A paper describes a structure:
In contrast, PKM2 has low basal activity and is activated by an effector molecule fructose 1,6-bisphosphate (FBP). PKM2 exists in a dynamic population of monomer, dimer and tetramer and its pyruvate kinase activity relies on the formation of the tetramer.
For example, acetylation of residue K305 inhibits pyruvate kinase activity of PKM2 in vitro and acetylation of residue K433 affects FBP binding and prevents PKM2 activation. Similarly, PKM2K305Q adopted an R-state conformation because the protein was crystallized in the presence of malonate (0.2 mol/L), which was observed in the active site of the PKM2K305Q structure. In the PKM2Oxalate structure, two hydrogen bonds are formed between (1) residues K305 (on helix α9 of monomer C) and E384 (on helix α13) on monomer A and (2) K305 and I35 (close to helix α1) on monomer A. The hydrogen bonds facilitate the intermolecular interactions on the A-A′ interface.
Residue numbers in the entry:
A (entry chain A): 24 to 126, 130 to 531
B (entry chain B): 25 to 125, 129 to 531
C (entry chain C): 24 to 517, 521 to 531
D (entry chain D): 24 to 116, 219 to 531
Write the structure that this text describes.
């Protein structure tokens, strides 16, 4: 009855429900792009496949998309067990990079001197003495004493001298320098565009390949989102834009970015360098909160199970990080190198599945529902009122599921905002809405392919019966259990205005 | 916060039309005429209480006839027609005097008054000797016991005991009349819960088709069972409201509530049996537990007492009605105010006025949160639909919650969660329409149209009826948002469907 | 847990503490102005004596004051058991009254609905009022009242409406009939009254109050802050320590309550006239509102009028009256008041005792932990060590279930700040200032005790004297016994900055 | 207002301006056991030094302790700045092995402040450890390590019999499913906060910092959430024992911990703790919560507490004030043990006892006034809460004073 007493009552031997609510996004790479491995990842729990356009050609990514769709459609024979898989495009954005090593990695030692050059005669001759990068205007946005970080901020350089096309720096924090490492300038205002010419081509390619969502990198303000929106244009209007917050400016101007975006990713990787590492959790919990309040999907990302790249078991800190991300209210959790290049992609997915499910059984649901309700504005919207009514009814009868018949996903999205314990089975005939539904916590999208019935009454019963079988087959509920059913009152409607409390036949 | 809620209470902010709390009116010489009854219904009367502590069956049969005559005078228009319930108040185990010589003798402090059981003095009462009808009083009373007469106004202390008499000293003098009620706060009264007279009155109630029985002096669960048994099969649908008016009733309250259909906080006798200082504690306790259980609770007795003789109530009385509603009482009651008073109409209107202002002051969202949180998790589809509807109503500021119901069950389940929006209960059952007044916020509406073959057409007919009712009575306008609770498909006997729908 | 669950927990067989916290204010009149009766009323529980200057001469009230002080000082021989009694001056103010009945015939006449009633200003009819013609003392009534407006007579029981208009007369039609007596109060809710808040008579009364050394003033018909300032100015420098309690008896007073409360030392909810100026069904709204804001501001609030009306004629109160007193205490009123019940009723002693019993039971029904949580929540952050000590003591009293909170004060400031947060334990305020001892009754929970011992030279020794005095008081008054725990508040050297938690010796 | 709204209001650019309340326990090993290193680790923010007795001999561990105390007493020429440092013995693990019995008696001779008893399955095991310590080390604060399923189930009797608890997530994650560890952690920390007893979150909090100069995002999140859960101390195992960046690991925990307690809803936590506060006749307990209440009421710079046993300082800490708790004391084994409790920044008195007891108290108070003004807690004109005894030689603490800073 209090947060304190709630923690005191948390017990290990209380099994979670079988349904796992928070989405799992997996970065696809060499370790996981084969059709067979992709099949295993789907039944391991992968909901969204992220394609990182920071690397690889369009031919490479087109091939990955095909393999993802091949693996996904191999389960399409049984619509009851079929799990939709979303495809996400992660833009390169204004990245700053090395720089090919001379060719053995070079050792940077503390106190030593290192020069940065823009002369393209050194772009493949990087060593202990000289360094190249692809930022043309780095010598007009940086002053003496500035901090320069390379390779995930594991190496830091302090500028001593400045020139027309070079920089003399001292090795503050030193380590082994590799080729093509990420460069960060935490204090500098960056001249690089939000949507470059390459970004435009990649975004247009995403529309061509019918991707479900776009992860826009290094979004600093609302105008950056608007540019990405305009590039997608009319043809890609239904493609959701998830803004990645990875700079100080992004956190600072989060409100205007969230409003413009369809969702948010907490990009803790770059954010942990642009911003002091010990401030990251503040940024995470803040953004997750405002997203939960706004009812827009939020993704927690990067290094959640980092050590699982080499180990079949995560660390205790990693197990904690995933659980806490869920407890904070994250709609999706993400895996990068763990699934892209690691030695245990399948293990990393299964682990996130296990932890997330255990975490959502620890959610102080009734307090959370109260807080989310006092922030909910009063409107004349029948879907909004029905969603709230459905969630509270699900708490009242300890529902096995909340069945939502939706065309666009809106009714299912608004149910998810109030965080029910029971899984939300969203029945749809729209393949895209089924895939995009994975962005919201608790939504278990199921795809109906039966022809639409003239008599609307039995067209509803057809879809409801389908959701019943899905719940039974996937072990959410059984005969004699109670479920909530949401549907419109007549076809062609843009609203769900009817709630049902029905026993499972 | 509740404090800040109090600080923001505004006398100028107009209240929502439609008053939710039921008004129960005791019918007597001042209000039993058809003419007066019509005005009382129009003033806001929802239930008519007939007190069988006085009067004959012939007298009450005529009163019931007058109530239904006045009630059915508005029956020509089912849209504006307001159902009126009939309540039978049992005599119960009452201890009474004692016919005087019908004048009044004066009792003075310090004087000696002799209580006798000799029936030779049952019609010869005066300031010297006093007769009463409790044959075992000398066995349950001791020397030093305090004896109260006439609503606890006259107090006597026992000085000596006889086999059939008591010698007492008047400790609180006053004017003594005939047939006055006697209370023995310290004594263990052994009178039967249901007497032979009660049996004949209860059987009479069944014949007269009364909607509810106010069982007097209920001490325990078995007392309720006796009343239930007497009503039997023929009266199994009659609601039993247990009146709590003694210490044992408060002590064994939980089991009484479980065995009953509802509760009356009978402050009159209760304020005599226990210290008057404690009545508000018992009242707030009982209303709280009744709200929690979802069972009707009535606050009664002396709420506008001064209005028996004056056209305006006192400041304590105005406060009393308001706080009763704020406590969470489903119904408010008038006794002498409407039974024998000089301003019965003014009393009804005043309660209506105060009640409506009071529910506007209710912290609706906090009250709902507590009721939502205390709600028991069950597999019942109707209960889930009910609380879901109330949630929806707050979310969309619903004009009303329309409920189709046969037994009233679904309508009652909505009421227990205390929505701000009025509950329009559409039924074809006239009895459930009458019994619906026991629950706050339920505006019962009686559909007279025959049952259609097409089930969806039958539902639409009843729903469109409620829509017309709400518009006519000014609950909502065309284009407003209302909640509609019905069944989903024919056969099943539960309300499991909620629709959020615009007013045509 | 919740308020509802707290209601269900209320137990009638659960005895309250011996101490009764809310003050009882008794109006003194013919039924109670004798020395013999006044002694019994003090024993019954009277804390403040109200002298209604709406009636009586200066000689009359002086004798009443003399009688009050005689009865009070009859207990002075034992300073342990001595209970200070305050003297309040209730001003007449802008009252409008009739008008003596003709004398020929009966005392009261019968005004019948629909009949014509002429109101006159001609002093020839000053003592010849009847069914046909009625005199009142408002000389400007014809110039302010409008045709169609309504006039209320005798506690609003009688209502008339103006039909015609003359120079020194008004022709009215009886709307609500009834029995009309002599010198009855008259209300003009829908009119702009010329009468000043402080008339020439009020000034003489106020100055007379300073002369008689009254403790506080109940200013009648206060409409705005400027009225409070006029009262403050009349009391002047000699009466600057006299508390000004503003009585809210009209719509304007309710409307402009905030500026009034700020300028005042306290507030009376004058439901009598207020229940005539505004609709009677709105009174509880104004009552709970004013009490709430007074509790928030930490200023004393009095609920008054008709709390136990029936006890004027009967030895027992009605059920509505028992409820009214209990709810006023639960609302948060510092003081409850009796008028005709003690002034001229048949059972003034029984009425005082009843208010004592009900108030004590009501205090044991207070949900203290919720109330204390809210009073802190709305408490401004200082920047004042006295505030911090008061709060600490109150919560400390909760933690050890303290028998009392002992406060050494001179102005009363310390004790007031403690009562502001509403502890359950009684507050024993030890002082040598007799006036502050009397004024202390305006605050809930403060039991003022007057120390008669001479000021001991050593400040530390002076403290131990006054503290041990409070111990003996608590013992004798039955608040706590040997072995219990109490809280002590003192200063370090001659504001309150010191707190102690000590076992009762 | 609400917790959700509190999250939305969290600010990265709102600088933490207090001290660092939660303790840092560093496992001492080959990468840290030198006097030269230990001085830098104390400066970095180490409050407790852990010695794992699963390895090493009594001779090796004895040499380790002297270096800790040598490094610690190197600052002992300035009591105003002197950071006390406690010593803890972590056993190897039948409640105690024959080796444990010999190692425990060793710790008493070496004058350790704490004992981290391994594999605590029940309260009887805590009794068999308290027994070995005997009257010799009756002031040795026993911290029970919950490492298996039985420890979790029977946690209530263990917590009662113990002076504190360590959440040993390492071996616990092996016994129970790794996804259940966070549940066990939050439960045990919650109950420990309820019972007013120290709780330690340990193992792999900054695991990657053994070989890398900066931690991962998961590790940075783990430390912060540990503090937000309500942990009194966080621990470093291999990060300080055999790691390559032991100094960086300590400075990282100090940094995360400070940002974490600036994120804590300071009002909601206290209201809950105060709501569950047991009703007793204890004057010190009442004074403590009264002081915390007053501290929130005036935004006190600190809460100065004069204690001998540590109890009065502990009782203030159990109700989680935002203001630092400056505990002035003479018993050196109390100032060091004070690190087990969040918020208590201990200060050791070196001044001789005055005859004028009021002047004696006024000296210890002035001592704290100097300390807090120098360590950036409060300045001149600020308001602080002082908790002392009433009349000399009193049984306990019962007096609260609110006084401007000179
Ligand atoms: K990217
Ligand atoms: K009766
Ligand atoms: K007056
Ligand atoms: Mg990145
Ligand atoms: Mg009765
Ligand atoms: Mg007045």
């Amino acid at each position: 009855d209090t947060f304190l007493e709630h923690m005191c009552r948390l017990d290990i031997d209380s099994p979670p429900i079988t349904a796992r609510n928070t989405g799992i996004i997996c970065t696809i790479g060499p370790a996981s792009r084969s059709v067979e491995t992709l099949k295993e990842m789907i039944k391991s729990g992968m909901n969204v496949a992220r394609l990182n356009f920071s690397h690889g050609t369009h031919e490479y990514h087109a091939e990955t998309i095909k393999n993802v769709r091949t693996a996904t459609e191999s389960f399409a024979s049984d619509p009851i067990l079929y799990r939709p898989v979303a495809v996400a495009l992660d833009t390169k954005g204004p990245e700053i990079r090395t720089g090919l090593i001379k060719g053995a990695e070079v050792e940077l030692k503390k106190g030593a001197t290192l020069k940065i050059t823009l002369d393209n005669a050194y772009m493949e001759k990087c060593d202990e003495n000289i360094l190249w990068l692809d930022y043309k205007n780095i010598c007009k946005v940086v002053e003496v004493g500035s901090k320069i970080y390379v390779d995930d901020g594991l190496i830091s350089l302090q500028v001593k001298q400045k020139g027309a096309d070079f920089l003399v720096t001292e090795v503050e924090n030193g380590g082994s320098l590799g080729s093509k490492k990420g460069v960060n300038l935490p204090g500098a205002a960056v001249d690089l565009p939000a949507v470059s010419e390459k970004d435009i081509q990649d975004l247009k390619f995403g529309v061509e390949q019918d991707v479900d969502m776009v992860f826009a990198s290094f979004i600093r303000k609302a105008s950056d989102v608007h540019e990405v929106r305009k590039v997608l244009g009319e043809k890609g209007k239904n493609i959701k834009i998830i803004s990645k917050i990875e700079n100080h400016e992004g956190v600072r101007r989060f409100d205007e970015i969230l409003e413009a975006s369809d969702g948010i990713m907490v990009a803790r990787g770059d954010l942990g360098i642009e911003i002091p590492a010990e401030q990251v959790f503040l940024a995470q919990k803040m953004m997750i909160g405002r997203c939960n309040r706004a009812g827009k999907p939020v993704i927690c990302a990067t290094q959640m199970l980092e050590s699982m790249i080499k180990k079949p078991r995560p660390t205790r800190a990693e197990g904690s990080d995933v659980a806490n991300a869920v407890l904070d209210g994250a709609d999706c959790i993400m895996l990068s190198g763990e699934t892209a290049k690691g030695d245990y992609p399948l293990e990393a997915v299964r682990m996130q599945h296990l932890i997330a499910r255990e975490a959502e059984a620890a959610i102080y649901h009734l307090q959370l529902f109260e807080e989310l309700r006092r922030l909910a504005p009063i409107t004349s919207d029948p879907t909004e009122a029905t969603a709230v009514g459905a969630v509270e009814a699900s708490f009242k009868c300890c529902s096995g599921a909340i069945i939502v018949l939706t065309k666009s996903g809106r009714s299912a999205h608004q149910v998810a905002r109030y965080r029910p314990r029971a899984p939300i089975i969203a029945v749809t005939r729209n393949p895209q809405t089924a895939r995009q539904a994975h962005l919201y916590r608790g939504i278990f999208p199921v795809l109906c392919k039966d022809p639409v019935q003239e008599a609307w009454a039995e067209d509803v019963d057809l879809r409801v019966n389908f959701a019943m079988n899905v719940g039974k087959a996937r072990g959410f509920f059984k005969k004699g259990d109670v479920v909530i059913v949401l549907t419109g009152w007549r076809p062609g409607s843009g609203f769900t205005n009817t709630m049902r409390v029905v026993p499972v036949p």
